[model samples]
Target: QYPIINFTTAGATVQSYTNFIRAVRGRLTTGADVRHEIPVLPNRVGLPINQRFILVELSNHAELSVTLALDVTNAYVVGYRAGNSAYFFHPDNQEDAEAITHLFTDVQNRYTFAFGGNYDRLEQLAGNLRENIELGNGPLEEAISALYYYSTGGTQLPTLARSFIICIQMISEAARFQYIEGEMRTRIRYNRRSAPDPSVITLENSWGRLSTAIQESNQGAFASPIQLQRRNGSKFSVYDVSILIPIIALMVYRCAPPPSSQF
Candidate 1:
């Protein structure tokens, strides 16, 4: 018996939910604490936060990562190199910006199909975008808040991949950015004398931060087979609870009796 708080994504998955319900009602020959059902009904609640963050652990990690990764590409001095660089493009030069926008719109407008619900849309978009880049098409882009989505009562997130492909892709872009910047640096250097403004360096740091955040922000998820007997909570550890819990659980304004347990 889990709590009765209704969540839009409650249909997603859970272990605590399954275990809590099973442990209480289905007895191990130790009789059921049927009352366990009572607390759960009204004590409604809320786990792993996904996406990126710079100053923390996935706190707005998405926004931070995207800006770091793509924003640089959006603003810059592109050599004949930056486009061939990573996932580069220039709308002004390529003349296909409108076409890309239209294609993305067409695909995105598919009935019940959204780039939001699956990787296919993004992949298609990314492929075209990359083609544009190699052909030096439109502005290097971003979905902007691709990860900073505003969750509504019924807005569902894609659960198919069971992994953060978006984050992974952006990190790939980061790696691409490194190469793109290197090429840009070489071109710029050969074109001019000793220069230290290091525009590329600043942008490099931005991409670096973005990729780091993308990686660090990801949550460790379990997409394994279901276990009907996955009872837990009696056991706890820093790793299982993540880095946040220990500080709160072990605070000096602390605890307790010496009757049944020790800290």
Candidate 2:
């Protein structure tokens, strides 16, 4: 089913994804500034409706901006874009939303060209998709791996297409999960009490299950355990999560199609 739809285009998307990952990788990994790597504790006790807007309460706007950029980038990769509401960097009525939106384009243009165009600097990346998929440190690797199963039906398909969800896609949903988790972990690490969000946590569990499934699939033959799990998983692409424009608007507004009136 996937191969029927994606057989020819997989390589192209891989190239595009690699370049995007390269840009994001550099930005995310290089920063160890005076700012605490751990997020500053938000005054959760204060009554502010916007707390959900910044769920993790990050001190760095740069990271937040890049975060959405990656999400938007992947969304374009295999048609897995999260809905506009999933982007909660700022309110649609103000400047923060606009800043984040432009930042997204900046990452795309800079990296797409920096990597010297598709398949151009293939040698510079860790290795080809084949090699990377085996490494499994990143969700993209896991995703493209499942992509193999989907397209080739190595796991066997028409049988498990939309019926199954893999960890790679579950990753996208975990951005929120991670943010929420981070805050709680901060509390736990410092001996402060914290509450857990099982909603995102269980969805987050798909990553481990999917990872284990991938390992077991290789030995057991791909699609057998493929029937393991979900309600809205993107069977087509990994790290693919969507919420139907379900962002916070402050409570929402991380990114959205710009209003037609903007021009």
Candidate 3:
């Protein structure tokens, strides 16, 4: 289920999307020094938020991109306010909410047109929808095939189409998941002890999952029991015991160093 809200449409225009992308590029290239204050953190702690840019160069010589500038301090502020009170509602929450609403609306508005343009260009470049579809079964596959057809002007619709489609789809899906997860984070508990660390951990976990899934899927076969068991054991040991092993080993070695060195 998703929340329903009417975000401002004024900034949902193509020009706005382009501006947003430009803003992101600026932030990435020259605006790192600009510190964004987050509202959620206590007055004692000071830190800036992280930012990212997504650039998708389409097959039709067009580009789709967005800059996501997130301040977890603001998220925490909003989350705390939202989680408190008799009604458990506060205006502070609205700030992050509005930011997210604007971000998504901007991206979606741009994406809708971008996708449409790509599709139209595909039709023009491919010159034959039936043949492309027959060769490429799915939307993702077809999109890539269209691009390949544009680039190579090849009629065969090589496997490269499938590979490109799969790669882009995987990346887009992972990005979507990250956005959703980050938005959700703004509504949950804010642990100062863990704060940014937890978010980083979450991102690492997401990347690991995505990598594993993609590798497994591309293998065209499932892992055997031996492989699964080994993976599970190794993962468990790494997470559970390996973290502490170094410390334990250091302590033991220090206590039992070479007699001459110890003396």
Q: Rate the local accuracy (lDDT) of all candidates.
A: 0.23, 0.25, 0.25
Clashing pairs in 3: 38-74, 40-77
User: In model 1, where do residues sit more than 4 Å from their true spots?
Assistant: 1-52, 55-113, 116-120, 123-129, 134-138, 141-172, 175-263
> Using lDDT as the measure, what is the rank order of every candidate, best first?
2, 3, 1
Model 1 agreement with the true structure over 1-263: per-residue lDDT tens digits? 11111111112123322332233222211121111111101110111111101110112213322111111122121111111111212334333233223221222121222233223443454443221221000011112232323122121233211112333222222223433323323433333222112332233333333322222332422222111110121322222113322111111101121132355
Question: 2 or 3: which has the higher lDDT?
Answer: 2
| TM of each candidate vs. truth | 0.18, 0.22, 0.20
User: Model 2 over residues 69-98: C-alpha lDDT tens digits?
Assistant: 222211111112121222222222344333
TM-score winner between candidates 1 and 2: 2
Report the number of the highest-TM-score candidate: 2
- Give candidate 3's TM-score: 0.20
Model 2 spans with C-alpha error above 4 angstroms: 1-143, 158-164, 167-170, 180-197, 201-263
Clash totals for all models, in order? 7, 20, 2
